[PDB]
Design a protein around this nucleic acid. Structure first.
Ligand SMILES: [Zn+2]
Ligand SMILES: [Zn+2]
Ligand SMILES: [Zn+2]
Lengths: 55, 129, 196, 89, 223
RNA sequence: UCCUGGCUGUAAAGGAUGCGGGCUAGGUGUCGGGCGAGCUUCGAGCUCGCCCGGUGCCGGAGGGAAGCCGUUAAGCCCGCCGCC
RNA sequence: CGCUAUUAUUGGGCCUAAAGCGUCCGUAGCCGGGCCCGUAAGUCCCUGGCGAAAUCCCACGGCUCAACCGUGGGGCUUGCUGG
């Protein structure tokens, strides 16, 4: 199978991380993956299709 | 004071990567740093490094992609022969082909794999993985 | 243009913040008054409200949870619930509603909405432990830690909170297509405000 | 300096009272009718020497290295432990 | 037999349990890298029936502890246990009680609830095979004063490590490994936890697609 | 115990934390200098924000046996001396 | 000898467990910003002359096999020296 990857950083998601995934709230066509470190530190993310530039 | 700028560049890259940055700036530039970044880009650890001109020296703008675990300079710059790379590999890297040892030779700066192909030795300066 | 007249925005007091600030908010901060008060801009509020409306409309209603510990935000959340089918917990958010199945009102939703990520911190910790996105209203003194979608607005005014939740509910219904035009939603904003 | 003495061709265990090893060696001794522990350890030492030579020769550069590799594999074939189409691994 | 027994003699209380019972989730790997919470050992009893055999339920340590009062001493029992499948899944747990059976039951349930995936490979300079008999690269772990470093080894070299690490790695499915340690290893709890975290840290290393074939990396079960 | 000219060279002489350089979120106070806005009884005056330098209290990630530290590190790197 | 990372180049510690000189100036020594030109002392490659034999590793052969002895290939001699 495939191992998901964070949208901000390019590191794999670990099997018991406090991560999240959600559908882009602008386009609705790309899945955003966020890891625990990026969520805590408030690292911004950018959709790979529309470029909504969210937190 | 400032003794070694390559070490500072690599430690800054390591920390910024650890905490999740997109771009990084390396203020005192140098041709060694340029060549090391060239090798890292060839082997796929970074992307799109650029040189900027302020009247003092060069600045290096580097983009990161999420592939570096640890990057560091080797001090002292040990000399190494063509038949002794395995020892330093086992000392600095975690697997038999995992990461690169950067070597300065009389033919230029390269990886130890290329240096072994050519059958030469030199000085150890940096490691990346 | 704006979803609601700028006069209405500014009379509610959405552009008004506190004296304290933060680095996470320099995105949304537009000006500094001469008394030390930091002022927000409303275009970003409008944009983020539209985006959040789309996002929430992409969810089944009853798997939506709203929270407000503050007194001035308890009735707006209850009306948001009554109007969108979502659940609302205004009072206290007993610790364990999302982590201890042995309690009576045990739930585990799909998304969370908080009025203030500091006052409502107990709920935000528990959501972090189950893996759901978080939508939060944030002021100038707020951090954006453990927040996936943010909405800049005053977070302490009864009228401002009422207006924001009114707009949110309206956009949710509009995107769910339970109404054909926005003007088909004439519920008075004065029904959201706290009763003195 | 000192001259060389002759050294044992077998090794002993590091700890003498481990239950797993005791059980294993007891079963082997009973099944193969071995007089004493010393025999087992002799054969185990033979095997360990083979394994160490393999580990050392694996991925090493030199004519002498490939010579030693072929010699090892042919000696094993002749002893009857591997077939003619066998690799160091 | 056991499948239907355990699946229909139990009513869940969480949405993950509901999904697992109705059948939207069938494989153990679909629960991990999403930020789910696991509150029911029946989930794992279903998606991994191998963690119910006594051959896979090693108890690692028992300790006695005391609380003093104006009357006397009140005794308590602490139990450290581990569970696992021998093909890439392992969990560790602790349990407190007034009797050994209570403690052991609670510990096994917590172990079931705390389970992780690991990666496996060869990694070593001296084997260079593509079979997942060891770990693919060196890793580090820590808990308390204990610092563990695991290194890949060749086939036939069995588990050069203390007994607790031997058991945990055997339950995780590793057969050959070298080790280096620092600190007070005579604390079973912290030694075990450090080995556990070292194993978990196989997923925190960034790899390139070539390395996967070069090292025979396997995530979870093989073939 | 004070004054004038010398000797002694010791203290929990303690931040119980050697010195230089680079990097890793910040918030809120106060001293000095500078810039910009506003008020002003027009004063070397008052309020607000920003840059540099000092000096405090909190605190996320991280570290640590813990107490605690946490851009004034007890974190990651480049150096030199002293000690166990 | 190892166990012992309780001598720590690899590879240890110095707020409170042993341990930062009371503070500063500076001699030897160690460590030293960026670019260009030259030299080739260190450094790397290639090749010549040396580093006795026995001892160490491997294969084949002779005493029943082996220990042992013989033939050949590598190593060791911590390195020196001519281009
Ligand atoms: Zn990330
Ligand atoms: Zn998008
Ligand atoms: Zn292998």
């Amino acid at each position: 199978f495939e191992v998901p990857v964070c949208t901000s950083c390019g590191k794999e998601i670990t099997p018991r991380e406090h991560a999240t995934h959600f559908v882009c709230p602008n386009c609705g066509e790309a899945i955003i993956w966020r890891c625990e470190s990026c969520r805590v530190l408030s690292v911004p993310y950018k959709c790979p299709k529309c470029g909504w530039e969210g937190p | 004071t400032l003794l070694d700028p390559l070490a500072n560049a690599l430690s800054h890259i390591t920390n910024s990567e650890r905490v999740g940055k997109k771009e990084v700036y390396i203020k005192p530039a140098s041709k060694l740093i340029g060549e090391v970044l060239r090798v890292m880009l060839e082997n796929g650890y970074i992307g799109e490094f650029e040189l900027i001109d302020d009247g003092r020296a060069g600045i290096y703008r580097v983009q990161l992609i999420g592939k570096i675990n640890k990057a560091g300079a080797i001090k002292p710059r040990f000399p190494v022969k063509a038949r002794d790379y395995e020892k330093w590999e086992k000392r600095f890297l975690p697997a038999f082909e995992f990461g690169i040892l950067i070597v300065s030779t009389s033919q230029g700066v390269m990886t130890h794999k290329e240096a072994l192909e050519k059958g030469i030795g030199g000085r150890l300066i940096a490691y990346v993985y | 243009e704006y979803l609601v007249p700028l006069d209405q925005y500014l009379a509610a007091g959405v552009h008004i913040g506190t004296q304290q600030k933060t680095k996470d908010m320099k995105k949304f901060i537009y000006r500094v008054r001469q008394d030390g008060l930091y002022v927000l801009d409303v275009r970003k509020t409008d944009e983020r409200l539209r985006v959040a409306g789309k996002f929430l409309a992409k969810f089944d209603p009853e798997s939506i949870l709203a929270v407000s510990v503050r007194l001035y935000g308890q009735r707006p959340v209850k009306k948001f619930g009554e109007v969108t089918g979502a659940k609302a917990i205004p009072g206290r958010f007993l610790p364990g509603t999302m982590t201890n199945p042995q309690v009576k009102n045990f739930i585990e939703p799909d998304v969370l909405i908080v009025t203030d990520p500091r006052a409502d911190h107990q709920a935000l910790k528990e959501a972090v432990e189950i893996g759901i996105p978080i939508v939060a209203l944030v002021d100038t003194e707020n951090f954006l830690s453990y927040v996936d979608i943010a909405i800049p607005t005053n977070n302490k005014g009864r009228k401002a909170l009422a207006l924001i939740y009114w707009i949110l509910a309206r956009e949710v219904l509009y995107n769910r297509k339970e109404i054909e035009s926005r003007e088909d939603f004439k519920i008075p904003v004065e029904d959201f405000e706290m009763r003195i | 300096g000192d001259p060389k003495r002759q050294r044992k061709k077998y090794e002993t265990p590091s700890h003498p009272w481990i239950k797993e090893r005791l059980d294993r060696e007891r079963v082997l001794k009973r099944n193969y009718a071995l007089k004493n522990k010393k025999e087992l350890w002799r054969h185990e030492t033979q095997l360990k020497e083979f394994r160490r030579r393999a580990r050392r020769l694996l991925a090493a550069r030199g004519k002498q290295a490939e010579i030693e590799r072929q010699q090892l594999l042919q000696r094993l074939y002749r002893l009857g432990l591997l077939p003619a189409d066998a690799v160091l691994d | 037999e056991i499948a239907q027994r355990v699946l229909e003699e139990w009513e869940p209380k969480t949405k993950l349990g509901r999904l697992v019972k109705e059948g939207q989730i069938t494989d153990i790997h679909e629960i991990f890298r999403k930020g789910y919470q696991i509150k029911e050992p029946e989930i794992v009893d279903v998606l991994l029936p191998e963690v119910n055999l006594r051959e896979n339920q090693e108890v690692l340590d028992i300790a006695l502890t005391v609380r003093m009062t104006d009357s006397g001493r009140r005794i308590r029992f602490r139990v450290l246990a581990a569970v696992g499948n021998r093909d890439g899944y392992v969990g560790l747990g602790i349990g407190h009680g007034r009797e050994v059976g209570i403690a052991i039951r609670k510990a096994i349930n917590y172990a079931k609830m705390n389970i992780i995936e690991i990666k496996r490979g060869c990694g070593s300079w001296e084997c260079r095979c593509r079979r997942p008999h060891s770990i693919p690269f060196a890793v580090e772990g820590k808990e308390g004063s204990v610092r563990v470093k695991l290194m890949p080894g060749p086939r036939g070299l069995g588990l050069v490590i203390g007994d607790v690490g031997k058991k945990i790695l055997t339950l995780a499915g590793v057969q050959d490994v070298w080790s280096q340690t620092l600190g007070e290893t005579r604390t079973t709890v912290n030694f075990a936890k450090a080995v556990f975290n070292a194993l978990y840290n196989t997923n925190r290393v960034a790899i390139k697609p070539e390395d996967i074939e070069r090292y025979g990396i396997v995530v979870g079960r093989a073939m």
